[model samples]
Target chain A: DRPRFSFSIAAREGKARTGTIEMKRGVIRTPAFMPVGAATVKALKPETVRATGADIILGNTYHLMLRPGAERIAKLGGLHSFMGWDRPILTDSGGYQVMKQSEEGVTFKSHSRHMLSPERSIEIQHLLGSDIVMAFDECTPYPATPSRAASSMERSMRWAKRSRDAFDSRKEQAENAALFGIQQGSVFENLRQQSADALAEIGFDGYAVGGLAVGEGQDEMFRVLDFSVPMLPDDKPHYLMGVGKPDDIVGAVERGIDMFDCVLPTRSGRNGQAFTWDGPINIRNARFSEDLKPLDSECHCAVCQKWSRAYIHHLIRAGEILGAMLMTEHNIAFYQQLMQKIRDSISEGRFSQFAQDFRARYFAR
Target chain B: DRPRFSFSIAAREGKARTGTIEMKRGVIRTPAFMPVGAATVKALKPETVRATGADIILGNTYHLMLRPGAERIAKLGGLHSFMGWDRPILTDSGGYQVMKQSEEGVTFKSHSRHMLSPERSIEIQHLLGSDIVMAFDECTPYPATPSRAASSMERSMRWAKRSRDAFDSRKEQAENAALFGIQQGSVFENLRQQSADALAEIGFDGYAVGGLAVGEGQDEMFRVLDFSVPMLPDDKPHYLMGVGKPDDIVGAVERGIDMFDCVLPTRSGRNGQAFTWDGPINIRNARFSEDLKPLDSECHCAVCQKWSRAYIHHLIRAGEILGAMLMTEHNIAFYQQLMQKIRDSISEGRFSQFAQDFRARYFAR
Candidate 1:
């Protein structure tokens, strides 16, 4: 019998490497940037979603569960068919812990009676039938004391273990599904190492370095990543949670992060922040009123293929919804294109020079 | 050398007919529905707009003139290239009625000193590179008395002659552009006939039946069309302004109206209204929570091809923008498909039977 899940590293350049995670549904090339929807953001056709070079779509379990309910989505043929997406979906583990956290799990004051323990989170992800299910872990708020960070990281490992048990019990889903354990440690090296080892002891299909992008500056997050990524097992896929700018992604890739998901590209796209080879160009600028240039000179994206900065600028200023769609559509393809290049550079063992070239150009303005 | 504009009737059944209006930019098949965007509605790519079988896009001269300014659009090579629409654009004369009307034209109160004299309206339409330009006319208020309606009709015809004169002045533009006179006379048949005669005396490339669908019941609108449409010259295209529901359009076609435009399909669509073969459906219906059927059993639209009513219902009820896009997108196709069938039935000389069958099925709900 053939395998349902396997991750293979193809080439390495320093800590950076190109790899592919092949599953029954599709292959996820390393340094993948997933576009999110509705908070869940706006909805695009699965065809356009796929056409944007998206390997996987990131879904929010909490919002989806509240609006349509997991059982409703499950009653339909899970999220993939519910949303008409044929590709893999990696759902967040209802990462909401509003007011209180007990050993049983997090209790909500924001939403009614919705309790999310590690077990329930995994149960919901199973109901949604996601391809890569994430473990439930509490995020240590930014600027946590070492003691507080260590204490939170220990409970996270405890919760991660519970998520593992809950996921393993769903043997029928496990036949086609894979579980990813999230490692949470504010910015402390020992805490991050301890959390990593604990997740390793619990074991998972993949590992995600979590909680670093939580309002922590990029330099500190990068510092933590430098030490933390090395603490995790090299054989497993390493995903960076919530860290997704072009510069953030490039630096994290060099430090060896293999997967990423964020609302930054889309979130900023709606606000008129269009990413480009030359960095983020705000389309709301008055100067673009009749610029007559493409959003990016080097990009051959669908938006750029037929649209101009002048049109995008006018559309946004006039408060048109298509402006956001165009901006986000370009932003998505741009991120995916960046990852492809990142992988290609790593494969050629020229990522360091590529990074220097990209950074200088991207930071020029 | 061939003329830049021509109209030819292909077939007729009673008053119903199928025809084509060929212009340099594109051919407009009789009985076309143009989707609207921001008051101007949402933005859709011209490709999807064309793929949905739209012969021409309708532009609001007032909106275009105000926001981006027609001169700015002209500098950007007009609406066609600026908005990336390659097909023909039929621009409406500024039809805003806020408070007062002068013998010269109308003045805006909701907006600034914006005056819309016939000459300026025609000027703006030309600046935006319109293919078929509409004559500026005031809509007689819905409950106007016979005397009040006749006075308004006289003023509208006065405006029509001025617009024609102004349009004729642009020698280079007139060689390629076509001007349409709009008929306005509230619900009074004699005034409509008078308005039609005056417009014909001044001469226009085409005629549009205006002021009928403005809060008048469909039956009254149909009654007005019965008398009003035959008064206009049969040699030119007959456009029905602001009457666009499937039932409204079907009856109007039976009474011999040829072209139609409105924001109804998209406006109602954003509010979760979806037009289907059967009738108008509110996609937020709990009945469709898991209906599992296509949005329309007979629809092969891109939305229906891969999506179910359950998904559409869920998307709409969740307050997602994609819900609006999906509903509007399908609504647009559903309308175009309806027109296609209308044309087909008329061409086959079975329009009467087709109209009867459609009304019964559509009204069954």
Candidate 2:
């Protein structure tokens, strides 16, 4: 029988790897950079977003569930029709949001001030018709004591079980959808192994390594990935959750991570920042006020092709919505383009050299 | 030698007259509809405005003279390039704004309240490099004492003399740009005659009958036009200032007037009020919330071709900028279409019947 999900490793050099994930929605080249549309990619018409070469996008279940309401979206024929984007949407289970809420000592008056349960979280993702759903687990925050970390991990394991049970009930209608259980343990090697083993026994379409990149310095984050990514099933796709920066993505990809989602590119874009091959450029800086060159000379995105940095800077300074729209479009296009380049290099057995060159260019401090 | 500004009287029936003003800028066909691009026609890229069959656009001298200051615009290369509109621009003299200010007992300190004199008014227009410059005059407010009205007319005549002198000083440039003297008298025949005689002596490329639509009844306005329009030189273009309602334009045209400018089409459009071939349609009404028909079935504008009332109503209700942009485009397009149709009927020698049919159909209630 044909596999519901399959990944074939085309080539590898040292630890860096490249492959493709075949699913009902579309074929996603590994080391894929998914544009984070949040609730909706603002200002840009949906067709224009697709023309920018985005295969899939990530949406925040927490944000969508709050606004436009999950039930209303389901009534309006799901988010695809409501937002006019026909591409596959990966909705992160409100796990991170739930974790953040508890860490901030937030209380939900409706549930007698109890913390968010995994059942409600999974139900929201299912109602969203999410093509890829994430299991609800407490995202272990940075800098925790051994006792505090153990208690969070214990509560997370209990919630993860409930998430699996809830997902199982919707499995028939969610046939094309895949639920990924997140492995979380606050920097402890033994707890990490226990969490990973429990998820494998329950079984998921994929596995996500969470609890890293949460203020654990890059050296330590990579150290965790060094041990964690290899332990996940080799046949199933491995996703690195909430991973970041260009260098972080490259390092995660080299550590055998096949998927990722982050808000740095989008959030920074809206805040007058842009990512480029020459490193980051702040659009609000006075130097760009009259700089007529494109944001990135090597890039061929539509924003770079049609507009100059001076114009973008002027728009940003003027606080125009078009500024955020254009910058976001450029950053998303840059990421997607970089992913394609990385995939090409890896497929040709040149990943080690590619990774070295990428670090040299992107991390040139 | 042929007159510098001459009209070709193509057709005349009942009170509806049709003709074209031959000028250095281009021929301005009578019953023309001039779009108001106060400082800029919002949303519309300039070329699209031209594509919608606009031959001339009205620029608010008051607005331009205030922000972006006229001299600054001149130094940056004229209004044409500053706003990116290459076609002819007819500039109102700020006479109406001055009158409104005077009536409100408001003093504008920015431009030196005392300097709101006729001489400075004419100077600003010259700086703007307008193709059609309006003569400086107070728009006589309604219900004025006849003696006060006579004094205002005398002040305006003095201003008209200053305006002509300003034009003479810039002879080479002014040769291409035409000065249009305004006739202001506030519905009093003796006052109208007095203002017209003073302007005739100063001489102008064209003349306008002002002060009639200043809160005076329509019948009183028609009477003022009847006497005032004929007093201006028959060799030059005669404009009816701030004169309209579509029926009012038809009536003024019948009384020998040849030009007009008003904000009805654009301003009303912003409020979801649209001018249609059959009648006006108020899109904000609840009845149109689910209607699928176009704004006007017979209109050929791009908005009509692509959007429905339901969609536009929704966008308007949600306060989307696209709603204002599209509705304004269609409204301006509709007004231009009406003007073109009026011109065609006149050229075909059926203007009287056409006017009768239009008034009957549109004002049936």
Candidate 3:
């Protein structure tokens, strides 16, 4: 039989749902938290990541295409062999490129010098041999004028059609690679409906509701999700693009989001900040200078179990590279474990009780 | 009997010899190679260095005292705890500083500022808490004018006496530390005799021959060593400071020099050159790009065992940091292993045949 992707809802509580995205590569249990690997995932070697129980990791089309160019990567035997990462890779299109233009164009300087068009984005993802590739489209700013937002969303819908066409063209050689179309709208019901309907008509291996987390408040995001989640194909994987923090992730899962990727954990870890059950702990603080406690007592990450807060604090103070490696490893492990716990609660039909308990315990810390 | 510096002659063949330097810290066998920690001996991670069968490592007083301030290191539980290497460390005095001075009075530019210093010569070495501290002196340039050479050599003698006095005053805290006086003379036999006699009179735990390998030909160096090595106390360890290529080391050992240090292995490795049983191989050359051979087939370092010359060549061409790390590791391991083999050959009374065979085979490649 040909490689196929299918989603089966095993349990549901309120609007919260639990499901699995079964693909030839592997089964990605719903509410999957994908560790974002940029340049290369630092610290945790490939085997270590697998040992930590990661289902999938996300690669950036922007970073990869820029360095070790996509052509060079394919020639060297694709991203999986080059990085020694064998699991499924969910790659993001450079949509954030256009979204950032609303603020400072200076921010894009670090991303790339080349323009990120739909053609280039899809081509790079294809070369990377990503198992799950996102569609190329611009994410509208939260407070855009209705006319401006509609114009951007419509442009994205057109790009989504092109992305689907490109994906279908490559279907002969793609083997098990799957493409997901993005639904973009700036809190407009009619625009969101049109975008979602166009994507469903074109059809995709998965459906992603994009552009919600771009400075829109959580209440507004949840409100948009309530209206839009139902519109996405329930039988296909539902991805929440750039949809964020622990609370945000839990809430998005409750609202039927199945996949995610963010730079927060890695970025925070390099800066000596750690995510724990009790919110986040800043390892550089004076309070941790002599504290014998771990970053999180409840966590089983190697950093938490083998080292003390004081030692980590000292390493950070001394500016050792190992400090960044250890913290990033721990954060990635934490994110993966959190996703596993969320998947278990949802599958067991205890999501409501688990959500309340997770929120309370995490916030209390 | 109290634990003190002692040597047991295990065997001797022709001019090649092997023995053991038994001290309170540990027993260091003849022809033992000391890895260059040079302020921290990076990447090996402490235990890794021990795994290579190293009993001691050489640290740099000049570099250590400049960064991390020696006093700060002592306060933070000394170099052992600070760097996490509990084994013995032999630190060099800033003798290279005086040799680095051209007619401009040692002007150094850093961060766009010129700094002149004469006091920095000995002050830094005293603060570093080295276990085997060297005498501060200048290396004589080869083929120097007799007057200039005599002037430089005499000044080093004056500095050696001052070093002895300063070391003696701090004897209580420096109980475990031993000062090694340096002998300096160009290629002149009379100058070498006077230099050695003066340092022996001042007295030290060990004596070092310092100026022969500056730029002098090997035959000339051997001529100087033949006259100088026997003048130093036979009971104390005789160190040949900053010797040379493998052939030079073998010759120095034959002349009864007991300890040696140099940067040939490390510097050559970073430049894509590797030392093998049969001379050196340049990995960056085109011939190695498709060659599946290891750098040294007889050796078994991780780089040689797990990677091919082709992979290393590719990595070097790609300018990967792993290339430098891998080559340096292999080169260091090769040098250490070579030293061990030389020691074993001497102990088994086959050093004469070993030296002849090594020279013949090493030169053929």
Candidate 4:
């Protein structure tokens, strides 16, 4: 029997809601933040990620399919078994990378530069045995005219149909994985509405608002989300693709977005940046060389609780691998904790006040 | 009151013995291998190292003093707190690194290129709060003539006295930390006996035999150990510095060495090498790309129990940091397990047969 996928809102405060996304693998609490595991999540094991409060992680279709190759991973028992991550995995369609290179398919720039198509994208995701498979869609670049945006959105809608068909053809995968259609229209509200309507006509397990965080300022991104989120069906889960910082996630959640994935926390951690309740801090600063305080006093994460700023600062300065590991773990924990707090605030009907307080305290530093 | 350091042999087979060295921090079972935790043990946490069955870890005075500076670490509660490692840390005097650069003192090539002396080495180790502070002595390079070796050995003996004088001056650190004098002579039996006698005259809680394993083959190393081990005080612990592989350690154990520290396991692990009961294998080989077996099927380390060769190979081929972490952890565990087996074999009065079996099986691959 096929595994069922369902979502239910437990409580709602304005556009913000606290809910659970029930999947065969596990239940993902909303609003959820998925950490980017771009080639093994740096130094953490899959079990460690689960222990760090992550219900789901996002793997890069572009990187995985190229280096290890989809067939290789499939032969080794798929991504879940290969990486030792048994929890839910959400794989982005190769379309974002493909469209950046070519309209028809993505040509990797390795020794062979393997080209990928909509069919290949679905096949790879299926081979990886992901719980959530995103539809192949061309992400419209920013600064595009209204006509360019419409054309891009139309191509994505057409590709969505093809991706759905390819996904449906995989009998075993279809029973386990849920397909998500991506809505791409640049910043045009009408194009976004048209994309959402076309996707709804085709149908999917969920919907994602794409192509917003591409060089457009935060205000402009919020403006697009304000008008675009309502166009999607209210019953299905809404995911914001490649979207954002803590503030951005709060704003998107407030505008009815239910899921988010970003590399800010993980990437910034490798470069010595730490996300705390008091905004983000660069541990490379000389001032931190002697600071005995934790990265964040409010954070209850193991790193923050046991490690002092001076220690982490020294590790970073010394170019130690454990420094990157601890910082990445702390940042991921922070994001998850932030999501949990957001869920709590929504459940208690105090999301607006929570958001306001967070922004003030976070930015005040 | 000062913590008294003592060593007692419990059981012996030939020259090999199973014993315990009691220290201020804890007891170390011999034959013991201290994993090199240079700049955070590549990717493992201090707690993880402890959990991996490490009774002690070796830190480099050269690296620690240069990076995160000794003064800075002392201000942040010393190395134990700074690195979050509460176990006994045996720090080598900067002599091994400095001798390679200059005869007088180490002249670093950084912006400051700080020169370190025997007094400075003891002071830095004291500030770092090392459990076992090594006496400062020049590590006579391999392939030197007997005259050159004697000159280096004589100079080292003089410096060893200076190191002892400096250590005795630190009243507080002397109470808690045990000082280990080093015996440095290239390979000559007379020089070895002379160096050992000089160290015994000055006196130390433990004695280390250095100036071997720097390109001197196994037979030569074992031969030097045969002459050197019996020269050191039988009442004190005998440490083999920067001394090596599974076979080398086992052979050294049979010759009565108590403690060993080497970078082969940790460093090779980061470079994609895995030490197993069947010998070392490079994880980057294409042969392991589909081999689902653990690095060693017989081993019981956490990584070996959970991760497969296929997964570790993928990580290594992709140059992932987690690969280094997993490999390092496994290799460290392998060394510790080998030590435990050696100890057990000695206790059981079958060390020679056990070593014979190990070499035959390990080298058979």
lDDT of 4 by residue, A240-354 (tens): 9988999999999999999999999888998999999999999989999889899999887889878998888888887888888889999999999999999999999899999
Instruction: Output the better candidate (3/4) by lDDT.
Output: 4
Q: Candidate 1: where are CA atoms >4 Å away?
A: A38-43, A96-99, B1-3, B37-43, B96-100
| Residue A312 displacement (Å), model 4 | 1.2
Q: Best candidate, lDDT-wise?
A: 4
Q: Which stretches of candidate 2 lie over 4 Å from their true place?
A: A1-31, A98-123, A150-168, A171-173, A186-197, A200-365, B1-365
**Per-residue lDDT of B334-354 in model 1, one digit per residue for the tens?**
889999999999988898899
User: What is the alpha-carbon lDDT of model 2 when measured against the actual structure?
Assistant: 0.74
DockQ-based class of model 3: incorrect
Could you tally the backbone clashes for each prediction?
7, 2, 1, 0
lDDT of 3 by residue, B307-344 (tens): 66765675566654446555777787887787888888
Give lDDT tens digits, candidate 1, residues A206-285: 99998876787889989999999998889999999877789999999999999998888888888999999988988999
TM-score of 2: 0.67
Candidate 2 on B1-365: residue-level lDDT in tens?
32335667777665556777665656777767777763466445456578778878888777667655677667656667555577778888876675424421224544454334455666677677678888777766688999989988887888788778877787754766788898887878888888889999999888888777677778888888888887778767788877677888777877877788778877777778878877888888888755667888888987787666765665566554456656778888887788888888877888888888988988873
For all candidates listed, what's the TM-score of chain B alone?
A: 0.96, 0.91, 0.88, 0.96
lDDT of 2 by residue, A209-304 (tens): 988857878999998888888777877778887778888888888898888777787778878888898799999898885566788988879878
TM-score for each prediction?
0.97, 0.67, 0.70, 0.97
- The DockQ of predicted model 1 stands at 0.60
Which DockQ value does candidate 3 get?
Answer: 0.10
| Per-residue lDDT of model 4, residues B230-288, tens digit only | 99998888899888989999999889899999989888999999999889999999999
